[PDB]
Each structure stands twice: as structure tokens, then as C-alpha cells.
Amino acid sequence: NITEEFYQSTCSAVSKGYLSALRTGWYTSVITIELSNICNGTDAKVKLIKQELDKYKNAVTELQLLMQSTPATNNRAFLGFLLGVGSAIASGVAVCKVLHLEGEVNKIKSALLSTNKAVVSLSNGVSVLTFKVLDLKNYIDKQLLPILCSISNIETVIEFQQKNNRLLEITREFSVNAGVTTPVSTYMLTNSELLSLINDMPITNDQKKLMSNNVQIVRQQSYSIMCIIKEEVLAYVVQLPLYGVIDTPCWKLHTSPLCTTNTKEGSNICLTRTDRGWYCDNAGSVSFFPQAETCKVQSNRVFCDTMNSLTLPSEVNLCNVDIFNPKYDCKIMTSKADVSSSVITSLGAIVSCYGKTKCTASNKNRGIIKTFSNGCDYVSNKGVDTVSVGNTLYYVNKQEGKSLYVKGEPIINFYDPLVFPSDEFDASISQVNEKINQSLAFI
Amino acid sequence: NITEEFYQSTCSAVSKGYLSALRTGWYTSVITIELSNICNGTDAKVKLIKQELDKYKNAVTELQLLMQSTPATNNRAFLGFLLGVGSAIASGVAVCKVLHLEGEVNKIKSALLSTNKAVVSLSNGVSVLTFKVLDLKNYIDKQLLPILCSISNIETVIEFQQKNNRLLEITREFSVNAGVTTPVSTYMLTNSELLSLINDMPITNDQKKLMSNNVQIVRQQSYSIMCIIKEEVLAYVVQLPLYGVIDTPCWKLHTSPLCTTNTKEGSNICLTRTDRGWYCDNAGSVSFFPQAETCKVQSNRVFCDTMNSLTLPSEVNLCNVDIFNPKYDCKIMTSKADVSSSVITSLGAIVSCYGKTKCTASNKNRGIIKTFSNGCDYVSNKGVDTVSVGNTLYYVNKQEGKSLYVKGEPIINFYDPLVFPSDEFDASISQVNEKINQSLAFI
Amino acid sequence: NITEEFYQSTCSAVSKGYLSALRTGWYTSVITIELSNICNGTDAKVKLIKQELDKYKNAVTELQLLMQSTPATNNRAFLGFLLGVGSAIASGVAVCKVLHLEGEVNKIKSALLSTNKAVVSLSNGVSVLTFKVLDLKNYIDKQLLPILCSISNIETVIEFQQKNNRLLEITREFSVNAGVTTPVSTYMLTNSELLSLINDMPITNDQKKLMSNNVQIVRQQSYSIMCIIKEEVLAYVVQLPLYGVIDTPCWKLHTSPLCTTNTKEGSNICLTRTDRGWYCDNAGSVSFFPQAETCKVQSNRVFCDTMNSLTLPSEVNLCNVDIFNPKYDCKIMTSKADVSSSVITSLGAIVSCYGKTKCTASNKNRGIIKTFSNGCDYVSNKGVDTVSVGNTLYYVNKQEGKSLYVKGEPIINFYDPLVFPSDEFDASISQVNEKINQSLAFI
């Protein structure tokens, strides 16, 4: 049930009706691959086995050389620049540091001796879920040891290339990613293995249901950290998202520049709401994501990460209805740049048409059905297939939903251009007023 | 025929002589893969077939689970922040919504019964080109049904792994991309299939010739949208670029900070043209791409996307010759940051040398051939292989082309530092003048 | 030996003790693959060979069509916007332009006739290291020519698919990357081939030791440029990083907003150091990388690229101890945005808590151990596992290292809010003072 409201006064539109799925924590699991510890015959079948065995030996050496250092990563030091700075794999690397302590790998090696899935409590007190997805030790020792110059058939050559291929592909991913990959591919964790991992995960039924129906999103929000390879065990930590906030209301705020509508070049002043992005109710406050491109939207579900959010008071919503309200200082930016553009919303299109720009909305069967005059306007996606602003053609989202046009006078008309602070990049309503008050008194 | 002109007055250079190739629209095609609808024997050849058949069954289940939701995507809400906001796959998803209407898949399934390529007119009136690239139904039913515990040979095991591998790789791409991939890989569409798709495409001969000679660029500007999988048919929409603007003049404007040349720290004022990027003539106006990194340049051809552009009047070119012209208010930024840097142009290098920085240009055989003094200067790529500014070594483009040094006094000398607005991030020539006029009157 | 110091006065922390590894130049090598120049029988083994041979012929045609144009690339025109603009593959493309000169490929073809590794001096005077990694000519001519309708076995079908697979994968990478790939995958250059290339490279023993122990980082800083395919030779240039600066001191400066601590909404003023990023001593100056995410950190080693750096005087370090020092004008930004956030450092966490935000630091075994009051504070990673600011949970880095809390009064208390320039995006200490001095005199 997606609806949309356009606010003509502030040149902004809100698309509400979405449900939340916020990454609040991390789950660390240890995926393992049991390894094997290892002829004059020129047999064309043994030669193919010797070649595949060298690929196995090189991949093990390649991963050992890769891990002689700590898991490498890159970290930092409209309003996205106001965000904090985290360490995404800090939790996964912490689990990996524990696996280097002596005897810790033996605990994992022993727990997975009789089964392939087991919960292990590490030395530092963390209870991780362990998973042995490939047992190359069992295959090489039971099917490739008696052959080494002995009897060889082609069905073993094919089967060994099939099982070893997963190890080769995992090494290829880590070799070009410095031991940290995201999203987590199907070589690191197949769709059946990941689903089985989610089912055995200590989470609520709603979290299992949510993650199982969106495994492709879980992959995109998961990390695979190459960890340790000792004592015939190849272990890499898979860091999975914890969705501590589920099914709370979300809405996407779209904003576009609001300018005066003089055809004369350079005689206009503008005003743009800078608080655009995804908003979701979260624990009394509002989780504001200033860069909506960091969130994934599956149907009416919104997948975001709280690391890319700010925690704002719920009074920030008043900027949609009353941008001049005294409870919250609404963030805006001021510019003299009267350029034309359009913002494709969930159920329509905002059109900021200025200067001498041709702005239209068209249907594919009929052609132009509306011609926008100068100013900031809006059209619903019902009956409209494309929007053109200048030489840019926009396709609108053809999703079902009702739009509401909230009429109101553009607030840019309430400012005297002679004393309007034309170049404020990160300002607010009160901030602009303060500058206007000073410029007035001195006149 | 690439030429270049450096404007000493404004610390900017224009590289002209390029030809346009602008993405103006989209073409949606439906690529299909016909699927098959499906033993005590422990035969080492049947066992390999059973394993590959499970890979086939899992990939189908994995793609069915992936598509139970609408095609997921991420969208927004120097001057790149002035751009609009579109929905890249809005047109492709619209085609996919039609394929879910009942009987629509049967139209595609029937049209591709006797051939592999066919044009189908959908129910909503859109005429799409359909393509059956893989018929696993025909292979499993004619070569793998009588075997199921029957006679098995190794040549069938190898051939089934070859044909099924494309389905497995397509699933791997969609599993780590949430059903939307770009660029379109060769598993989604081989080079011969894409070229055949371009040839059967309803476009002019110039568009066919352009796309065929730059298929790698077309891939980078194309989307692959996993759509529907029902009634033994696996369909995904390939969204291809429409180049409605071809062979119009383009030019790249490079800008660098222009500062006063006092060695004393912090006593300088700067000025930087913010209108840098790719410019292309387009339908009476000028398509300005403020982030030149969004365009691909093959030889003298420039591939851009109008979604990443602004539509400006052609008078914006006057800022290169006369930044003070009254017809267009040229965009600049003002700073006190007198740091040294270089901008590698198409046929040379702009050098902004300030403070106590060592700035040189060298030849690989001889060494330093020029030492830059403080200010903004330029050197041609003829005879010059590298440029050094501080501890940063720049390699220059060794492309053939003539450069022109347009002498002129730096416009930063025309401003009195005592009343110069030192911190304007998104300003213009007129905007700075306005602020100077006010500060003067109050003195 | 990583240590950290937090500066309460300026809301910033420095993590020192790292060692440098700066990309200062490029090394260009020519990797080659010798190609072969090429039946009514329906044999199920010849049919599999005919199919794999068509994959070989199509890949060669696909790469020939890809290279009919010059190697395509995309280039430009907190303080990262102050950086210069280079051409990353300018040096590699220059080597490729030489390979198109007639007779140049024959020099490479002749040098690799009796060996697989050879140093060749090109016509323009550049001495490149050449490497023949795959000889498909020798395999097709000696193992697949007598078969073409003749005797065929399955071991040849498997071996031809193995050798040809590397050519097919290299083509797949170039087809979706327009002939330029980074990082350099293991198909372009295997781990053993790259290590052998580093060993035969004309570099010092320290550079060989550094690159060999961090091959995954070298891959991420290397380019693979598809170059020429003529006269049975497929050549692509691998552009490798030259680390001209090794083992010099580095340190990472983390900054966070410093605001006044009034609970009242919108009554605070802030101040944020904008000079955050990686700093490394380099040749008398300091290489400043304003976007720390461009550097890779392996253990205590920092891998950066001087193309993403500014060359600053060493006096910039005084901003950590005395932001008001007269030797360097420290860069800051001023805002009224009193939002709460945290910055995860190497050995702790900076917490900027403002408004009505809940900011805590917790241990996994015990829970909340510290509750932050309004202002900018810091906690060490010793005994602390997580930090919460609002609805955002941060995991801290669990690396061993001592932190030092340098007490001092926040410099934001030294400003009178009535005359404080609230919206300076790219300002400095002196710049703010200048604006304050003017606003005072007019009062």
C-alpha cells in the first residue's frame, strides 16, 4: 500500500507505506573446508589428476601467503557527510583473532568431526555457528591416495575437478579482494547452505522468515573474511546482518530545487531541502538515511544499514508540512543556480523547470500530455510513462499507488532577493533567517 | 582530430574535436531460456549426471525464490549534485510487470516455438524483441530422459555440464546482484547474440554501426533484469541503450584552482571554475556532464548518458573566452586553500603550483625540461612524458594533437583580497561581485 | 607498535605507528599468449572438440573487435575535491601505442621463441619485461592438428577445455570492462606468474620483499590493459605499482564535529576539523590523503597512491597539538548541525553526543560501562567492544595498542555564538577569525 504526497510549497514529495528491515548488528559464523595433507606414470588420466592436484596445492599456498597479515580493509576518518564512521568487519576480525589462539582451531576441528554443522563456544566467550561445507580431506584420502601411477578412470578426473573447483573459485575471490569480499558469493556459501545457516541461526521466526525470503539482499549486506588455514582446516568468517528493526514504517523524502521563475538569466534565487533520503521509525526516534542509494527496496520492504544513518527526533517530519515550524530547524541549502531537472519519485515525478527549458510529461501511446511552466511542479505516474526536462528523458516508475498534490505557495516567494543569502551550502531555515536579520539591520 | 586550448586567464583548458554518443532512451528485449520439467544405479557416469542435474534443479529453485519480490534497486532522493534523479530500470521493470500478466508468457513461448528470434507485441502495446538463447528443455528431454539407470557415456556428461554451465553462471550473477546486473556479461548475452540482437534491432544503420563497433561500451550501459520464470520459460529483460544523439561536437573542459602567488603561507586567495566536465552539442542546447568520469571515451568518440547531464544554453561556452561576459553567469568557487596540484588533460597538463611546492615537467630520456613558477601554467604533451607536483608523479596522455596556449592575465589579480569572499562553495561571477559590492559600501 | 592520542580540545584523534608503502610510479610489462592460426565426422568426442574450438575462434574475434579502438577509460576534469586529476593508464597505453608500430610485435615474438620470460627494449627506448603465459599455438598445432575426423580420445577433450578456459575467462573480463581491468585477476596473471614477475623485476630487494608478501594488494593497485592481437600473438599490458616510498612513518587523523552542549534544539554552533585522513612522511614534506578509504591497511603497513594525495608542509601536524598556531592555517568547517555520531578509530572511538541522544560504550559480557554526556569524548578499545550512538551500533577494532587521552578545553567554547560564522563549508582558523573580526567592528 504505497502512497505519495507532493508538497508544492517546499518542492518535495514523500513516498510512504514501506516496511523497515534495518541492519542493527552482526552475526559471525565460521565456515570451514577440511583439507588433505599430501610418480613416473605418464598416463593421460593421471596427468589430468596431477594438474588438478597442483591447482589444489597452489590454492592452499596462495591462501597461506595471503593470510600472513591481518585482514585488510579501507575505512574513513546530501547530508551523508554528517554520518559517523565505523569499522564494518571489526566484529568479524575479532572472531578471527580468536581463531589464531592455540587450540581454538582444534575445538572447531573436533566439533565438526561427526557432523557438518555445530555451535562452538570460543575461548573469549563468543558462541559461533560452525559449518564444514567441503571435505577435500575425505575425498583425496579415500579416492585419490591409492591412485598414487595406479589405475585411473575418467569419472574420477571429472569428479575431482568438480569438487576442487569451489576451492579454486574461493581463492580467486580472495586474491582480488585482499581476503574480504562483499556480497558473499555462492562459492563462499551456496543458497542451500545459507538458507540452512539462517534456519540454525539463533534468531526469531520473523528474522528467519525475512532473511530466507530475501537471501540475495542478505548476501549484499554480508562479508566473507578469510581467516585462518592451519591443521588441515581452512576457515573463513562469514559476517551476516542482524535485522533488529523489522516492519516499522518507512518513507522516502524526495527534494528538488525551488527557485523564482524569472526567464531572465541569473536573476533567480533558489532554495533546496537538504534532508532528503529514507526515514524509518526506530525506537522512539527516526532513523534518517541521507543517501537513499545505500538502501535496497524489495517490493514495499526497505533494507538499510544503521551505520549509514542519523538518529533524529521525530519532529523532523514537521518539515514536510510546516518547514517554518519552531520545533525543528529544517535543513535547506540556498543557491543562485536556476538549472532545470527532474526527480523520479516512487509514484510520480517532481519537475523543477526554470530558464528556457522544455519540460513535458508524455504517454507512450499519445505523446505529450502536459507542458510544465517555470517553477516546481509534480505529475502522477498514472497515465504518465515518461518525463522530459531539457535533453534528458526520464522513465517513471509504473508501480500502483495513489498520489496526493498538496497545494501551497512556494516559500521562495517569501524572501526578498536583495537580502537573500544566495550561497549557503549547509544551512537551515533559522540559519537563513539569522543572516537576513543582520543584513536588514545594516540597511 | 583532437585539439586543445589552455586559458591562462581562468586556469582552464578545453579539449575539443570529439564526437558524441549520448544515451537518450532505452530498448527492452526479452531473453529466454526454455526449461525442462522433471534411480538405484550407482554408475560413476550417472552419478555425475545426477550431480549436474541437481545443480540444474537448485538453480531453478534459487531463481524462483529470488523473484518472489519485485526487481530490487537503489536510487537517490563538481556540479554533479545539481543533477536530477531517475529510475534506471523503470522501463525494463515496466516490461517485466507485463510479463506477469496471464497469457503473456504463452505469447512469448509460442512465438519462439519454430524460431529463436521473434518480435512480439505485448498486451500493453509494447513491441519487444524476444530471443531464446538456450533450450535446456530440448536437451534434457531428447538426451537425458531415456537415461533415467540406463546406458551412460562420458561424452554426454561433458556436454550436459557445458550447456548447464551458462544457467549456473547466470544464477550466480543474479544471486549476488539481487536480480539486476550491469554491465551485461557474456553469460546473459554472448558477443554473437548481442551483435545479432543489434542487427535485428529497429534502429538506423548509423546506430547499428555504432553499437556493433563498441559492444563493450553497450554492455557497460546495459542492464539485465531477472524477470519471470513460469511455464518452462526463464525470461530476463535486457535493457539496452538508445543513442539518439550521434556525431555531434563534444569537448572536455578541465579546470584547476587559480590563486595568488605569495610564498607566505595563508596569504593567498583562490578562484576555481566549477563548470568542468564534458560538453556536447545536443538539439540547440548543450548537454553538460558535470562529472566527466561518468563518460567513456573510445578514440575520439564520447559515450555519455543524458541522465547524468544538465541542459544548458550554448552561451555557457563564453566562460572559456570571457568569464566576465554578461550573457551567462559563469560558475566559480572561492577558496583560501592554496595547495598545489595538476590536472592531466587530453593533450597536456595544467599545473597549479603554489606555496613552496616543486612542480616540474620531464622527458623520460632527458629529465626535467621545465620548472613551473608559482601560479597556474600549462605544458603540452609534445616532448613531455611526466609531470611532478610535490610528491605526486603524473603520466601525461601520449595522444597526437596540437595544443594552443591562450595568454591572458589571471583574473584573480583583479580582486582586492581585503574584500574578497574567501569561502563560497557554489558561487558565480555575479554572485561574488554582489558580495564584494556590499562589503565595499559598508567600508 | 600502534598507539593513539585523542585531542579533547579539537575533537580529533591520531593513530600513529604505521609504516608507508606509497605508489609513486608504474611498471609496464607485456603479457603474451601465443595463438594458433587455423570435417564430416559426427564423433561425440570430435563434436566436443569442435565446440571448444569455436569458443577459441569466437574469443579471438571478440578481442579483435574490442581493440579496433584505443583503450577506453573514464577520467575527471573531506578535502578530496582539492586533489589533482591524473590519467591512470597513460603510461600503460603509451606502451601499447608502441606495440602497434610495425615490427614491434615481431621483436616480442622473437624474444619469447626459446624462453617464456625476456626483457625487450622497445623502439621508443622503453625496456619492458615480456612474459608468454600460454602457448595455445604449440598445443593446437601439436595435439589438435592431426585430429582434423581422425582418432579422438576424452583426455584431449578435457585438456583442451582446461587450457582454453584461461583465454575464455580473460576475454570475459575484457568484454565487461572495455579492455581495462583492475584489480588484475588470476586469469590475467596467476599468483606464481605474478610472483615470478616481481622477482625478475628491476627493483630493490625491499621492493621485491614488500610486493611478494602483499600480492593481493599489488593486484588491487594494478591495471590490465588489452593491447594488441596480431601475428599469432595476443598481448596485453599489465601496469604494476612502483613503491618508491617504503617504511616511512604514517598516521591516521580522525575528526568529528565539536559543538556546544545545549540540549535546546538548534541553539548550538559547531566546528569540525576537515584535515582528516592518512598522513605519511615523504621526502621532507607530508603526503596527505584526504580520503582515507583510498588506502589499504595490512597489519601496520599502509598502502596508498600519491595520485590521491596532497603535498603539504610538515607544519600541518601542529593542528593536532595547537590548532591556533601561526605556522599553519588549520582547515576547519563550521556548522549549526548538532547531530550525534561516532568515529571508530584504530584503538578506540570518538563520540560526538549532542541533543537528546543516548551515547554509551559497552562490553559484550557486562553491558553498558560508560554513558557519554553531551560534547565530544573518547573511549579506548581496551575493555570496550561496542559503542552506541542513537540507533547505530558500532563495533570497535580489537587491535592491541595504547591510547592517550590529551585533556583540553574544547575550542568551540572560545567563540561568541552571536558573531560566529555558522555556515563555512571549506574554511580555516584564520578564515573564521577574519569573518569574526569584520562582524565585530560593525557592531
XYZ file of C-alpha atoms in Angstrom, chain C residues 7-414:
408
model
C 42.735 15.617 21.474
C 39.726 16.711 23.523
C 40.253 20.358 22.552
C 39.661 19.787 18.822
C 37.595 16.551 18.872
C 40.228 14.627 16.928
C 42.421 11.559 17.356
C 45.656 10.452 15.683
C 46.608 6.781 15.269
C 50.373 6.649 14.718
C 52.901 3.842 14.455
C 52.232 2.744 10.866
C 54.673 2.169 8.009
C 54.339 3.549 4.496
C 54.001 1.885 1.103
C 53.196 4.626 -1.411
C 52.504 4.073 -5.107
C 54.884 6.582 -6.712
C 55.343 5.244 -10.248
C 54.304 2.493 -12.656
C 55.903 -0.609 -14.142
C 54.618 -1.811 -17.515
C 55.011 -5.448 -18.561
C 53.752 -7.150 -21.724
C 51.962 -10.448 -21.087
C 51.528 -12.557 -24.222
C 49.538 -15.618 -25.294
C 50.749 -17.318 -28.469
C 47.816 -18.164 -30.742
C 47.201 -20.793 -33.411
C 46.218 -19.989 -36.998
C 43.517 -22.348 -38.268
C 35.043 -32.393 -41.127
C 32.028 -34.637 -41.761
C 32.701 -36.759 -38.663
C 29.928 -36.683 -36.057
C 32.106 -38.317 -33.377
C 30.844 -37.371 -29.920
C 34.452 -36.571 -28.955
C 35.250 -34.543 -32.078
C 31.949 -32.697 -31.600
C 33.113 -31.602 -28.143
C 36.435 -30.513 -29.662
C 34.669 -28.598 -32.442
C 32.584 -26.783 -29.821
C 35.627 -25.833 -27.743
C 37.462 -24.768 -30.907
C 34.574 -22.447 -31.795
C 34.847 -20.928 -28.316
C 38.505 -20.295 -29.159
C 37.737 -18.746 -32.553
C 34.974 -16.559 -31.109
C 37.174 -15.281 -28.277
C 39.866 -14.239 -30.762
C 37.315 -12.472 -32.968
C 35.747 -10.886 -29.881
C 39.105 -9.476 -28.759
C 39.989 -8.259 -32.260
C 36.686 -6.373 -32.481
C 37.203 -4.966 -28.979
C 40.600 -3.489 -29.849
C 39.726 -1.692 -33.093
C 39.601 1.419 -30.869
C 42.005 2.907 -28.321
C 41.845 1.556 -24.717
C 38.752 3.201 -23.208
C 38.791 4.896 -19.804
C 36.944 7.319 -17.515
C 38.712 10.359 -16.042
C 37.832 13.513 -14.094
C 38.107 17.128 -15.269
C 36.698 15.598 3.220
C 39.203 17.648 1.213
C 39.319 15.138 -1.648
C 37.911 17.740 -4.036
C 41.233 19.603 -3.676
C 43.092 16.702 -5.316
C 44.616 16.760 -8.775
C 43.479 14.725 -11.761
C 45.639 12.102 -13.455
C 45.382 9.500 -16.197
C 45.965 6.146 -14.509
C 46.718 4.109 -17.604
C 48.509 6.829 -19.542
C 51.813 5.018 -19.082
C 50.374 1.614 -19.970
C 48.584 2.971 -23.036
C 51.832 4.639 -24.127
C 53.491 1.209 -24.117
C 50.539 -0.163 -26.079
C 50.803 2.544 -28.748
C 54.398 1.420 -29.325
C 53.320 -2.203 -29.808
C 51.190 -1.138 -32.792
C 54.250 0.162 -34.654
C 55.250 -2.325 -37.332
C 57.936 -4.842 -36.429
C 57.471 -4.194 -32.707
C 55.363 -7.319 -32.155
C 57.954 -9.365 -34.058
C 60.598 -8.256 -31.547
C 58.455 -9.675 -28.739
C 57.533 -12.761 -30.775
C 61.224 -13.468 -31.435
C 62.432 -12.865 -27.870
C 59.922 -15.384 -26.468
C 60.710 -18.081 -29.043
C 63.230 -20.033 -26.937
C 62.052 -18.881 -23.485
C 58.913 -17.671 -21.722
C 60.417 -14.646 -19.922
C 62.555 -11.978 -21.575
C 63.400 -8.284 -21.274
C 62.788 -6.394 -24.530
C 63.893 -2.841 -25.345
C 61.166 -1.271 -27.474
C 61.696 1.176 -30.329
C 60.904 4.296 -28.281
C 63.570 3.281 -25.747
C 61.447 1.677 -23.012
C 62.716 -1.630 -21.608
C 59.720 -3.812 -20.725
C 59.599 -7.322 -19.278
C 57.749 -9.745 -21.554
C 56.046 -12.952 -20.458
C 54.435 -15.731 -22.515
C 51.998 -17.358 -20.095
C 50.065 -19.581 -22.530
C 51.141 -21.196 -25.812
C 47.890 -22.266 -27.464
C 49.757 -22.293 -30.784
C 52.006 -25.115 -29.578
C 49.051 -27.083 -28.201
C 46.691 -26.800 -31.176
C 49.456 -27.465 -33.710
C 50.939 -30.476 -31.886
C 47.843 -32.086 -30.318
C 44.819 -30.887 -32.327
C 46.039 -30.631 -35.936
C 46.410 -34.366 -36.782
C 42.898 -34.958 -35.406
C 41.463 -32.806 -38.216
C 37.698 -36.604 -38.405
C 40.576 -38.662 -37.018
C 41.233 -40.578 -33.791
C 39.868 -38.786 -30.724
C 40.026 -39.559 -27.004
C 38.380 -37.944 -23.999
C 41.647 -36.965 -22.280
C 42.370 -34.496 -25.089
C 38.849 -33.050 -24.872
C 39.357 -32.406 -21.154
C 42.863 -30.977 -21.547
C 41.852 -28.626 -24.369
C 38.968 -27.286 -22.279
C 41.426 -26.709 -19.424
C 43.977 -24.736 -21.448
C 41.399 -22.801 -23.478
C 39.450 -21.824 -20.346
C 42.034 -19.196 -19.388
C 41.646 -17.484 -22.766
C 37.854 -17.557 -22.427
C 37.957 -16.051 -18.929
C 40.383 -13.303 -19.971
C 38.012 -12.394 -22.805
C 35.052 -12.349 -20.405
C 36.854 -9.860 -18.154
C 37.802 -7.554 -21.029
C 34.320 -7.765 -22.572
C 32.655 -6.293 -19.461
C 35.493 -3.846 -18.697
C 36.133 -2.286 -22.147
C 39.655 -3.723 -22.216
C 40.879 -2.311 -18.876
C 40.549 -4.297 -15.638
C 41.509 -3.603 -12.020
C 42.320 -5.439 -9.809
C 44.346 -7.771 -12.036
C 42.728 -11.190 -11.665
C 44.458 -14.569 -11.542
C 43.447 -15.288 -15.148
C 45.434 -12.264 -16.335
C 48.329 -13.257 -14.070
C 48.415 -16.257 -11.746
C 49.908 -15.970 -8.272
C 53.011 -17.896 -9.347
C 53.370 -15.854 -12.545
C 52.987 -12.548 -10.692
C 55.500 -13.596 -8.026
C 57.917 -14.650 -10.770
C 57.276 -11.307 -12.476
C 58.107 -9.456 -9.249
C 61.306 -11.477 -8.825
C 62.549 -10.697 -12.348
C 61.516 -7.046 -11.926
C 64.262 -4.352 -11.885
C 63.554 -3.253 -8.309
C 65.390 -3.315 -4.995
C 65.227 -6.274 -2.620
C 62.981 -4.318 -0.246
C 60.508 -3.688 -3.071
C 60.562 -7.370 -4.052
C 60.057 -8.447 -0.435
C 57.225 -5.943 0.066
C 55.362 -6.813 -3.139
C 55.790 -10.570 -2.676
C 54.310 -10.542 0.834
C 51.330 -8.435 -0.323
C 50.459 -9.733 -3.787
C 46.739 -9.215 -3.157
C 47.384 -5.503 -2.584
C 49.577 -5.290 -5.693
C 46.695 -6.778 -7.685
C 44.297 -4.131 -6.365
C 46.737 -1.384 -7.422
C 47.477 -2.877 -10.860
C 45.787 -2.457 -14.236
C 45.458 -4.942 -17.096
C 45.199 -3.213 -20.478
C 44.185 -5.244 -23.518
C 46.629 -4.049 -26.148
C 47.284 -5.814 -29.464
C 46.473 -9.119 -31.149
C 48.376 -9.596 -34.410
C 50.794 -12.125 -35.923
C 49.603 -15.060 -33.777
C 50.353 -13.015 -30.628
C 47.831 -11.792 -28.045
C 49.442 -9.067 -25.927
C 48.005 -7.113 -23.006
C 49.933 -4.667 -20.823
C 49.943 -5.245 -17.060
C 50.599 -1.953 -15.253
C 52.162 -2.612 -11.844
C 52.719 -0.259 -8.885
C 56.142 1.158 -8.059
C 56.577 1.732 -4.317
C 59.170 4.498 -4.265
C 58.354 5.330 -0.626
C 58.615 2.457 1.861
C 58.751 2.295 5.674
C 58.275 5.970 6.406
C 56.080 6.956 9.380
C 52.341 7.192 8.759
C 49.424 8.190 10.965
C 45.653 8.449 10.552
C 43.863 11.584 11.767
C 40.226 11.054 12.762
C 37.972 14.081 13.256
C 34.384 14.528 14.447
C 32.153 17.600 14.916
C 32.764 19.684 18.041
C 29.613 21.530 19.115
C 28.309 23.422 22.106
C 26.348 21.253 24.523
C 22.942 22.928 24.876
C 20.059 20.452 24.992
C 17.846 23.092 23.356
C 17.311 22.304 19.685
C 19.125 24.490 17.172
C 20.918 26.688 19.728
C 24.358 25.177 19.183
C 27.256 26.004 16.930
C 29.758 23.502 15.675
C 33.243 23.184 14.415
C 34.838 20.273 12.556
C 38.441 19.722 11.509
C 38.401 18.975 7.779
C 42.038 17.804 7.503
C 41.261 14.180 8.416
C 42.819 11.294 6.512
C 46.114 9.452 6.203
C 49.388 11.341 6.637
C 52.796 9.920 5.719
C 56.252 11.475 5.834
C 57.547 11.640 2.265
C 60.697 13.438 1.068
C 60.783 16.347 3.505
C 57.089 17.097 3.083
C 53.962 15.233 4.241
C 51.805 13.217 1.839
C 48.228 13.938 2.934
C 45.458 11.630 1.690
C 42.153 13.428 2.426
C 40.070 10.280 1.733
C 41.450 7.547 3.989
C 39.247 4.955 2.258
C 41.589 5.059 -0.762
C 44.365 3.446 1.319
C 44.653 -0.233 2.240
C 45.989 -1.176 5.679
C 47.664 -4.584 6.109
C 48.748 -5.008 9.760
C 50.848 -1.869 10.457
C 51.521 -1.253 6.743
C 49.631 1.442 4.825
C 49.266 1.140 1.046
C 48.288 4.421 -0.617
C 48.613 6.106 -4.012
C 50.263 9.513 -4.353
C 47.761 10.377 -7.101
C 45.185 10.623 -4.278
C 47.368 12.877 -2.112
C 48.378 16.464 -1.491
C 51.939 17.531 -0.698
C 51.771 19.622 2.474
C 54.440 21.179 4.707
C 55.204 19.200 7.847
C 53.889 22.142 9.909
C 50.373 20.790 9.258
C 50.963 18.458 12.218
C 50.770 21.449 14.583
C 46.982 21.434 14.099
C 46.805 18.349 16.328
C 48.562 19.986 19.290
C 47.886 23.707 18.683
C 45.105 24.372 16.177
C 45.678 28.054 16.709
C 49.361 28.029 15.824
C 50.605 30.777 13.470
C 52.752 28.486 11.299
C 49.895 26.659 9.533
C 46.307 27.773 8.906
C 44.365 24.733 10.089
C 41.407 23.737 7.921
C 38.005 23.574 9.642
C 34.350 23.737 8.693
C 31.606 25.439 10.684
C 28.050 24.209 11.026
C 24.940 24.558 13.137
C 24.162 20.862 12.653
C 24.321 19.447 16.174
C 23.717 15.807 15.268
C 25.224 12.869 17.142
C 27.668 10.368 15.655
C 30.756 8.305 16.425
C 34.027 7.697 14.584
C 35.676 4.313 15.134
C 39.426 4.847 15.403
C 42.219 2.282 15.206
C 42.391 1.868 19.000
C 39.186 3.470 20.271
C 36.134 5.554 19.409
C 35.381 9.269 19.261
C 31.826 10.040 20.395
C 30.143 13.306 19.386
C 26.987 13.257 21.525
C 24.580 16.196 21.258
C 20.912 16.987 21.711
C 18.922 14.247 23.445
C 20.914 11.315 22.061
C 21.779 8.167 24.022
C 25.521 7.502 23.673
C 27.088 4.561 25.514
C 30.041 2.174 25.390
C 29.536 -1.466 26.325
C 31.298 -4.768 26.916
C 29.856 -7.972 25.482
C 29.968 -9.784 28.841
C 28.744 -6.990 31.123
C 26.777 -4.388 29.165
C 26.951 -0.596 29.363
C 30.099 0.531 31.170
C 30.088 4.251 30.267
C 27.385 6.783 29.391
C 28.604 9.796 27.424
C 27.365 13.259 28.314
C 26.856 15.949 25.689
C 30.076 17.002 23.968
C 32.915 15.232 22.187
C 34.523 12.431 24.207
C 36.605 9.317 23.584
C 36.903 5.768 24.895
C 39.714 3.258 24.462
C 39.147 -0.119 22.828
C 40.547 -1.810 25.959
C 37.587 -3.358 27.767
C 35.157 -1.835 25.238
C 33.611 -3.971 22.496
C 30.771 -1.798 21.159
C 29.738 1.856 21.061
C 26.146 3.022 20.563
C 25.121 6.496 19.383
C 21.376 6.739 18.891
C 20.120 3.708 16.972
C 23.560 2.966 15.469
C 25.699 0.193 16.968
C 29.446 0.426 16.310
C 31.883 -2.440 16.789
C 35.320 -1.171 17.789
C 38.612 -2.520 16.475
C 40.009 -5.114 18.894
C 43.652 -4.438 17.990
C 46.331 -4.245 20.669
C 47.581 -0.732 21.375
C 47.813 2.009 23.999
C 45.642 5.129 23.818
C 46.385 8.529 25.355
C 43.647 10.964 26.404
C 45.008 14.501 25.985
C 42.766 16.706 28.116
C 41.966 20.217 26.931
C 39.080 22.671 26.766
C 37.012 22.405 23.554
C 37.923 25.341 21.331
C 34.255 25.846 20.423
C 33.879 27.484 23.853
C 36.127 30.296 22.702
